[PDB]
Design an enzyme around this catalytic site. Sequence first.
Site, PDB file in Angstrom:
ATOM      1  N   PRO A 138     -10.748  14.181  -0.115  1.00 22.30           N
ATOM      2  CA  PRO A 138     -12.107  14.924  -0.658  1.00 22.30           C
ATOM      3  C   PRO A 138     -12.962  15.624   0.458  1.00 22.30           C
ATOM      4  O   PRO A 138     -12.516  15.024   1.602  1.00 22.30           O
ATOM      5  CB  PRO A 138     -12.901  13.785  -1.200  1.00 22.30           C
ATOM      6  CG  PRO A 138     -12.265  12.396  -0.570  1.00 22.30           C
ATOM      7  CD  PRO A 138     -10.684  12.647  -0.381  1.00 22.30           C
ATOM      8  N   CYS A 139     -13.650  16.327   0.178  1.00 24.97           N
ATOM      9  CA  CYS A 139     -14.525  17.077   1.310  1.00 24.97           C
ATOM     10  C   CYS A 139     -13.530  18.036   2.098  1.00 24.97           C
ATOM     11  O   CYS A 139     -14.091  18.642   3.111  1.00 24.97           O
ATOM     12  CB  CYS A 139     -15.130  15.851   2.304  1.00 24.97           C
ATOM     13  SG  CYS A 139     -14.024  15.887   3.763  1.00 24.97           S
ATOM     14  N   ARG A 140     -12.369  18.242   1.786  1.00 22.40           N
ATOM     15  CA  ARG A 140     -11.245  18.981   2.516  1.00 22.40           C
ATOM     16  C   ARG A 140     -12.010  20.520   2.414  1.00 22.40           C
ATOM     17  O   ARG A 140     -12.400  20.848   3.276  1.00 22.40           O
ATOM     18  CB  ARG A 140      -9.977  18.946   2.103  1.00 22.40           C
ATOM     19  CG  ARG A 140      -8.947  19.184   3.026  1.00 22.40           C
ATOM     20  CD  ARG A 140      -8.991  20.714   3.320  1.00 22.40           C
ATOM     21  NE  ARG A 140      -7.905  20.937   4.297  1.00 22.40           N
ATOM     22  CZ  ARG A 140      -8.279  20.844   5.483  1.00 22.40           C
ATOM     23  NH1 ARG A 140      -9.248  20.411   6.082  1.00 22.40           N
ATOM     24  NH2 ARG A 140      -7.190  21.181   6.635  1.00 22.40           N
TER      25      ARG A 140
END
Length: 189
Positions: A138-140
């Site tokens: 996540p947040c990539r």
Amino acid sequence: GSKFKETGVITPEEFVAAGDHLVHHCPTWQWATGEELKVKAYLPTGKQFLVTKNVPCYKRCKQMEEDAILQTRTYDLYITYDKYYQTPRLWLFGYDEQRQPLTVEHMYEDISQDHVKKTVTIENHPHLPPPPMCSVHPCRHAEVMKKIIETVAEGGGELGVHMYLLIFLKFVQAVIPTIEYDYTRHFTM
């Protein structure tokens, strides 16, 4: 002040709180404990990650014969909490028709290759035993995530972070749009 919409960060208490809503909305989701010895002190044993399995797929996500595919299998989903990133996490593990695990490369067939390299990765479970399963990062790319998060702003779903798991699953569908699992399947918009 979860700020899930502003920064996209949630507390472990909220994360675990979210599962209650996910399982309620769909009985396919179940809170799981995992290995008792690998349990987290700040994370309730009774509720460490969500999981849903025995979800088959009718086709792969590649490019073959118009009628190539002709085999059905089942996949397993898991949802853990990443304290470092402070956001919901989702894994991915499947099996063949013979009840045997698929190779990492084969597993990728049912996933976007352009995504498995960066958008997704392979890792061992923090509280579950081997073999290793696919773990999403996540947040990539906030660029695509902003769309799925923007869902909350749609004007329906109140401001309860407890529904973050449902919003999250929608994102995951974009990584595995070939798997027919339960996750609201888009609401209204």
